[PDB]
Symmetry: D3
Subunit: 255 residues, 6 copies
């Protein structure tokens, strides 16, 4: 029973769909709490190996509920640690896939960037326009956008509020793949299926290793990866993976 | 009255134009001192919300004055802290826009990369060729180029001295937008106007937050941004910006 | 005498060619030891200024031998520090160029990423497919890929095992330049020649500076580069390089 | 209802007392879940301004239960992320004080180090002896000990398993203050009272700033602190605190 | 002619003496501007090799002028970048020595910590008490105190406002040496003289290298130091220093 | 056959003793090469679990051979990467113990700081005096001294060249323990014996974890430690360690 989202399970794939169509899936505190609660529940479910987050064909998530912020003081925001709960999504250990159609603006752009894989429809429009409302990004946009697309384009988007289409996003580093709008959900599901049929521990360790690339020097990331790599050979799925390859068959991992 | 640059102010936009046409705007010590002095002055002017740096249609800046460096010893360079003063431009709090036409080579490329936004003419040509003079980049090119375009291309440019055209620069991460050469100054001024009409507080905070992305772990950058975002709720412009949006009217920012 | 590679010297260019056609140039512990040994020997040779690593037209390197990995436990892997020796290649001070044709998959992709410059044939195919075997990258793939092409694409490649063609690799940050397959070795030799004819001191310093971009804050990288730049003024090649420019002649470098 | 701890509230001070005398307050998964749950609940209570964690006169906490650790494999440890939940204690925003009497060994030493302030009885004994069981620190001991007392002493403690008495701990960086054993709880309550009667906003900001000192370069830490300091001028307690000082009266804080 | 400080030069030693005796040398905006201006001027003087900052026998500096802060909004503080100018003292390349007698509280403690060497009178009293005024440290105390004395003691000082005497400061990491109060200025001048008679290049490099220890990983700091050390071999003072040692004579440094 | 050092093995302890008594064990290129070669050989020997480095009662190592540096140009030093080979000592995976009596000055101070554990005789005198020779530390002193004893004291030592006695070094963070001069070698051997009788892999992992505390943020060090911790339970020695404790006997690790 969620009020702002829909959750479905199909095999080892969980799908969270934002469900505020009249508001173009704009994020509010309720969406934050529901999305993070569902994602965390899915993350702890051993029968789920990949999580998709998506919106509608018109909008993945177009901005935020401004009435919830308009009257905040610094003290209000600091005491609430406003938006901190979104960190629960980045903390999810299972691979997450943002399937982005139409508007992914402000908080919606930031939500997409929090996921590991980002599959965009050719209709995807990305932006961080809230400078127009007298504030800066507050859900990590200044950090993740910049790391994805570089300073020049991040500054342009964040200081002007201009939109970036799917093609620009794909050649700039923001998205994994662009697909036709009509195929977005099919393609996202296909990718989620592939990832969910990997070893759960291997896919988690791989994700963890990639995430280290933003948290330390290359020298420390290399050491971390190697130690993780060594540990993957303390697992049963590695031996099954190698058997399947030799026998030219599909692996049957126990996760 | 500067010797090597021209400075103009219109509304909330300041424009610094490199002006050594006899040398295709090659950078020297005087250009460094004047550009930084002018940018710092504009930064402290409350009636300026954006700063453009640009050169000519032939060259943003084509390298450096080599005679100023040819005879230097290590002691000379270390004592002078040669090039350190360019750090004053990075320290400017107001958003800066590089409008790059023609050659942006060596120091010129590094100057363009110091700015926040980079709008390039389709004529723009970028490079870091001073390996051919027996030195490496000294104005941050090895750091900013690599972060913008990745190791493989940065190494290629820096070790071979090859130029990169505007199309390659744009798909590689170095430039914000490419526009036709005839429209460069018009487009740059339009972008600067847009930025200068934003809340000065919000724009300063947004720029500062973006800059943190290169200075610490993602985890620390995220905390910094969130706290700066919380601070924004103590500003008049946060209240007015959101009120104006809710009330379907134009915001009247006061820059506080 | 090497069993798995060939080593050639042409003027100031060394070329290491992977030579296991029976295994599509799959890497193993022997290839690791031989490549790193050869590269280190070339690195210490004052008559070499650039090093090319390459495979065949069909494969740069298609992966790693499975046999070796299934054989050991964790305490054994930890005690052997399996794959750590590849770090010797990153420690090479002389510029390195990967000339990649055909498959560069898994360890092969990782090897190419260890080099400074990466020139790809239009036939090149990159990827990290070993997740399909329940096996993680152990040669820096999770680190260098992510830093080259960004999180979204790196997560996609590493979690799904999909390949990336040359055009995508070029527009994403992974490769320096794409050239026709028939021209790969010619183009790589030309690039290596160009780099090897630069000042050895300037090239080494430039490479070292670029590498700093992944190891510290931008602020520290800028300081490191500026100080290395200052040191360059103690070198003969700085003096000659700049004198030659001013006097309109070809520089005559001594690599000092 | 807790099984392994007691929780008390006295004005603005919360006190969590480890209560497993039969095991010298050895930590286990149940103690981890209960301590973190209690601390989080206290952290979210606006009527609490400081949190004390303490054990008995004989032991703060003598280690961790061996039973739980021998029970699992690696894939199980990784899937459970064994000990990760202790991170909730580090995430507490309200100031925390460890009042340590007697044994604080292994996980017990690590728990004390997670707190902001550490007041030690003269009877306190610290150490990381689990290397003797072939077991590594898993609660941050290799990180916090080293940062507190330096490499030489941390390597000594962690590799040999030797204990460190209160005097050595105080002169080495591990503890805030040493007091007589009979006075520990009185002194800890007095310190907690003092902290809890400060502005809740100022105390939280100060703690957060100090914590930054271990997460980034000094340059970034200085910037973070200065900006948090700037934000403090949006708080009522800054206004009242400074007004009270100027008017020579006791400040009357509202924790806003 | 400064208002809040006195400046004296003798041989290669400059001395800045805080001079607000009516306020026990409490820091205000004017002190910040004058101290930084004077230090920057001394830094650029080739006949100065060391800079002392000191106050009176009663107080190095006892806090700050609170009236200047009491009425500030966040916007006021952010726009002013309140306290940022103190960064100019950290940017001084010449070695700085704080000679601390009596109270060094709040900003005064932070000022002492900005210097390279800290010589304390046995009368010295350190603290960071502005939590009692509803704010946290704003001049780097949360960063430098914590790095000097460790988390437990820094948290204790900053959250309670308690003072730390010279003995505790010296065994905790905050001060270089403690001397009798009557000998403080004599000892500070002797230390400054010793430092000022070293090669100015070598002393600048040594200080810069030490400062890197707080800005990056150990691995990066080690590379930086080694490269700066290599650069030293381009200096006349390296040649003369080592020649003088080998030849059993006094070095004649030229500061290049 | 070494010219400047002596190497002995006793059970699982290797001992490297600097042997240039007429020069107060001053470091030169030969000592660097011999010490690093012996340490690396000992590190690869499965019958060695701890390595001691020591000098004489008068001097652990008093400075360096200045004639080897006096005539160097920047180009010479950069081309040689002068002193880089000392990095081989820090790269040793087995625990290293510096047993320091008398002078440990300049390079000798730096050599002591490169080791993991530092046991000092009460006669130990530490210093970094080479500012007097117109250079700064070149073997990591500016990095390791500062991290050990704090800025104020590191700056004092490095800018003035003053010496620091054993008592000051011990209360400042530089040394693990101070013992009487007559007991230095006995105490160092005792400590080395203790460490060498731990599980080889556990002692290596513990050392590795501690070393991370200087290479990244606390958040990243904590993650690294936990993953390492999890991996220690993929080893046989852990189970033996726990059996021995329960049975109140000495463990018999297989390393
Ligand atoms: Ca791109
Ligand atoms: Ca507000
Ligand atoms: Ca020169
Ligand atoms: Ca106020
Ligand atoms: Ca101490
Ligand atoms: Ca020389």
């Amino acid at each position: 029973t969620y009020e702002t989202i829909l959750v479905e399970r199909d095999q080892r794939v969980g799908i969270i769909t934002l469900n505020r169509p009249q508001a173009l899936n704009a994020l509010n505190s309720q969406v934050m709490n529901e999305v993070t609660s569902a994602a965390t529940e899915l993350d702890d479910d051993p029968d789920i190996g990949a999580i998709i987050i998506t919106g509608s064909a018109k909008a993945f998530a177009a901005g935020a509920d401004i009435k919830e912020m308009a009257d905040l003081t610094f003290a209000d925001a600091f005491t609430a640690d406003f938006f901190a709960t979104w960190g629960k999504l980045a903390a999810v250990r299972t691979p997450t896939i943002a399937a982005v159609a139409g508007y992914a603006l402000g908080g919606g752009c930031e939500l997409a960037m929090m996921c590991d894989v980002l599959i965009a429809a050719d209709t995807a429009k990305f932006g961080q326009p809230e400078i127009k409302l007298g504030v800066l990004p507050g859900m990590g946009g200044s950090q993740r956008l910049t790391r994805a697309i570089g300073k020049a384009k991040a500054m342009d988007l964040i200081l002007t509020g201009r939109t970036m289409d799917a093609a620009e996003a794909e050649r700039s580093g923001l998205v994994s793949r662009v697909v036709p709008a009509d195929d977005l959900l099919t393609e996202a599901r296909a990718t989620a299926t592939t990832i969910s049929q990997m070893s759960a521990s291997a896919a988690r360790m791989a994700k963890e290793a990639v995430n280290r690339a933003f948290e330390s020097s290359l020298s420390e990331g290399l050491l971390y990866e190697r130690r993780l790599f060594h540990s993957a050979f303390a697992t049963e799925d590695q031996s099954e993976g190698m058997a399947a390859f030799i026998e030219k068959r599909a692996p049957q991992f126990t996760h």
